[PDB]
Amino acid sequence: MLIKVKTLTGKEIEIDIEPTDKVERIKERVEEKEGIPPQQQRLIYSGKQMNDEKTAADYKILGGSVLHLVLALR
Amino acid sequence: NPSIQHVQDFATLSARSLRANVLLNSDDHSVPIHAKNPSELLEAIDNNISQTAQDWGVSIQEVEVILGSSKRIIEPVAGVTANTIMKLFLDNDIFSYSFEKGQSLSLSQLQERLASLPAHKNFILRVNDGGLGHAYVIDFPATTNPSRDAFLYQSDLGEGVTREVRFEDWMTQKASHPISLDDINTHFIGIAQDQIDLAHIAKLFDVDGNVKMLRADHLISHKTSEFNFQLFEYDLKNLENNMSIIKTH
Structure with missing residues (x-):
């Protein structure tokens, strides 16, 4: 299923995943495109941070969902 | 330098x-x-x-x-600072550095290239470091002297073994401390060993060289031998x- 990870500048990174994929896999495919280690990325899904060890299904990330990639220090 | x-x-x-x-x-x-x-x-x-x-x-x-x-x-977190620094060194009217386009080297390949760098040329290496969940750049300026000093540039979100560090704090405290090919090689080999040397991690990566700020329990154990290594020649006048x-x- 195709989701969009949007950066702060609104740049859209398409990503193909499965419901049982860990959120960590989404971070791996963002790393392939952007160069950011997964542990340096923060992914926001409608206002909420996510646990990388949970799955796309746990968080109800579906086809056409849009996640936001935060790349700033806390 | x-x-x-x-x-x-x-x-x-x-x-x-x-x-x-x-x-x-x-x-x-x-x-x-x-x-x-x-x-x-x-x-x-x-x-x-x-x-x-x-x-x-x-x-x-x-x-x-x-x-x-x-x-x-x-x-910026680590990978953004590492990308932008590659661009500072390498970008011009006909080249625009992007992580996804760059050719990655295996550790073996990198160790050979590094052990054999010409003395009169500048190089710059971008690293993603699987075990540390981290990214950083190593600058190898051209040198006259028998062996080469290198300089590490970074920022860090601080969720791993290393703690949080701002790009500017790093640059103005510790980036000009030179490290040898030995120090670097030691890190890449050592991080996958049975024991990791937290002192050496603090020396390379921590802004106060303070081993007590590190969290050895945040090492990403299964990735300790996964790197992305991108090595370029650079011309100082382009930077x-x-x-x-x-x-x-």
């Missing part, structure tokens, strides 16, 4: 100028750094924020507290030219 000074100057400028800071945090990787348009980048941010407030059913202000904004200095152009925003 004029290259380190250029990176310091960039770190200090990008900490106080929104224009230079949106360059530091840019992700239009196909556009070379000298040719980026900070006005358009900041507008892109405002458009994204405004769209996202409408998408989330909340105010612009609420989205800005979560995602950031175009009117606030943003401190200097990018900095002179940037110095006119």
Whole structure:
């Protein structure tokens, strides 16, 4: 299923995943495109941070969902 | 060692100028750094924020507290600083560095290239380090002297073994401390060993060399031998030219 990870500048990174994929896999495919280690990325899904060890299904990330990639220090 | 000074100057400028800071945090990787348009980048941010407030059913202000904004200095995490520094060194009118296009080397290949660098040429290595969940750049300026000093540049979100460090704090405290090929090689080999040497991690990566700030329990054990290594030759006058152009925003 195709989701969009949007950066702060609104740049859209398409990503193909499965419901049982860990959120960590989404971070791996963002790393392939952007160069950011997964542990340096923060992914926001409608206002909420996510646990990388949970799955796309746990968080109800579906086809056409849009996640936001935060790349700033806390 | 004029290259380190250029990176310091960039770190200090990008900490106080929104224009230079949106360059530091840019992700239009196909556009070379000298040719980026900070006005358009900041507008892109405002458009994204405004769209996202409408998408989330909340105010612009609420989205800005979560995602950031175009009117606030943003401190980059490690991979963004590492990409932007590669661009400072390498970008020009016919080249625009992007992580996804670069050829990665295996550790074996990198160890050979590094053990055999010509003395009169400058090199720069971008690293993603699987075990540390980290990214950083190593600058190998041309040298006359028997063996080469190198300089590590970074910032870090601080969720791993290493703690949080701002690009500018790093640059102005510890980036000019030289490290040998031995020190570097030791890290890449050692990080996959049974025992890791936390002292050596603190020496390379911690801004106070303080081993007590590290968290050995955050090592990502199954990735300790996964790196991405991208090694380039660079010409010092290209870095200097990018900095002179940037110095006119």
